Amino acid sequence: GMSKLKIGIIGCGGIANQKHFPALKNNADLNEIVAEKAAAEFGEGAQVTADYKELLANPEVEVVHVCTPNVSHSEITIAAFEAGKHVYCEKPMSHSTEEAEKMVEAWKKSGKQFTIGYQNRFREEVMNLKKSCDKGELGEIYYGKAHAVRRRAVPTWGVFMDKEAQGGGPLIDIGTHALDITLWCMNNYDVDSVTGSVFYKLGQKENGPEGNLFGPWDPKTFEVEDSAVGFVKMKNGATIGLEASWAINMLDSREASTTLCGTEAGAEIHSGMSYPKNELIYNRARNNQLMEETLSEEGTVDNRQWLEAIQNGTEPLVKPEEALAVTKILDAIYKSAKTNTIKF
């Protein structure tokens, strides 16, 4: 009935093939797919070139998915596709706040649709937590923690250690997932100030790579940080602690996680290298006894939801403003280098 939607993938390398294609193939029924393998392995129409402008091919495309490293995000998008298309940009909306704001402007005038690749928002336990906060079952949340820590899991295969493409280390690599979850469930985005510390300690150390989950790296060429910690004061008194790392001598490898302290109850999510099963634990007082409630994929869900928003004309879950606020906090943490607190 509904016409399939003609989709457009500009970059085609990791999250393009580790997520978008399969999500569009788990969901074929809704999408039209119009780095060689890609047109054939999942399309028939455009090519499998190596370029950027050989897209801009079949402008009859009505949706574009930019899975280009962070720097390309502002122009491989914005007027690029705001030229009149919908856009789904990848996990860090951009490495730079100024460029990030230059997209919500591009989209805000091309009144088409826009979302960002924050899929950890569709994890069943993440949704569980979002719903109980929206239901006010935690109360007013005044203290959160965004956990994006990796004892020794420096990614050694793609764009991630490139300070020019990606613009930073674990803080914008994985801290953006954790903080997105946190803010989103706290439903708090009014930032008052940001204090941060950024550590170059293990990345260029000689035995630094020793123990790394993905194998050794060259500490002589490591150009980003190995960890960072943030202190975020919200305009309502709520405070958010952040820690993000690819390599830190810390026991718990808990990433894409959050801890939430409300006036009525608490909750935390556990995920990452130290957790074979994701966990969600609510804590509260019930009948004058302290108690704990514990639990007894999201790639596809994220994408399907994306299409059904444009086809049906309604809002995609992760909203552009949300991802911009995540980019502005993480930029203000690196900005703390001025050994000063950034007021908003």
Ligand X SMILES: NC(=O)c1ccc[n+]([C@@H]2O[C@H](COP(=O)([O-])OP(=O)(O)OC[C@H]3O[C@@H](n4cnc5c(N)ncnc54)[C@H](O)[C@@H]3O)[C@@H](O)[C@H]2O)c1
Ligand Y SMILES: OC[C@H]1O[C@@H](O)[C@H](O)[C@@H](O)[C@@H]1O
Tell me how many residues contact ligand X (CB under 6 A): 24
Q: CA 139, CA 255: separation in Å to the nearest integer? A: 24
Query: Per CB under 6 A, which region of 35-43, 134-142, 170-178, 327-335 contacts ligand Y?
Result: 170-178
Under rule CB under 8 A, residue 287 binds a second copy: yes
With contact defined as beta carbons under 8 Å apart, do 334 and 168 qualify?
yes
Q: Is 65 annotated as a binding residue?
A: no
Q: Quick one: which of 28, 40, 83, 291 contacts a second copy (CB under 8 A)?
A: 291
Number of other residues whose CB lies within 10 A of the CB of residue 49: 15
Answer with the entry of ligand X, ligand Y, a second copy, none that 147 interacts with (C-beta below 5 to 8 A by kind).
none
Tell me which of 144, 155, 266, 316 binds ligand Y, using CB under 6 A: 155
CA 301, CA 276: separation in Å to the nearest integer? 21
Is residue 200 within the footprint of ligand X (CB under 6 A)? no
Strand bridging mode 114-116 / 86-89: parallel
Q: Which does 337 bind (CB under 5 to 8 A by kind): ligand Y, a second copy, ligand X, none?
A: none
Q: Is 341 in the site for a second copy (CB under 8 A)?
A: yes
Residue 174 engages ligand Y in binding (rule: CB under 6 A): yes
Where does residue 40 rank: exposed (0-12), middle (13-18), buried (19+ CB within 10 A)?
A: exposed
Pairwise CA distance, residues 55 & 87, whole Å? 14
> In 10 A of CB 335, how many CB atoms?
16
Q: Is 118 in the site for ligand Y (CB under 6 A)?
A: no
Sheet holding 279-286, edge to edge: 279-286, 266-270, 257-262, 141-148, 239-245, 227-234, 191-199, 342-343
Full DSSP string of 140-175: SEEEEEEEE--SB----SSSTT-HHHH-SSHHHHTH
Total of residues contacting a second copy (CB under 8 A)? 62
Selection from a second copy, ligand Y, ligand X, none that 68 binds (CB < 5 to 8 A by kind) is ligand X
70 is in an annotated binding site: yes
Would you state the structure tokens that stand for residue 261, as one six-digit string? 């302290």
**Positions in the binding site for ligand Y (CB under 6 A):** 91, 155, 160, 173-174, 177
**Positions in the binding site for a second copy (CB under 8 A):** 124-125, 127-128, 131-132, 138, 140, 142-143, 151-152, 192-193, 195, 197, 199, 201-202, 205, 207, 210-211, 227, 229, 231, 233, 237, 239, 241, 248-251, 259, 261-266, 268, 280-296, 339-341
**Which residues carry a binding-site annotation?**
12, 14-15, 68, 70, 73, 91, 119, 157, 166, 177
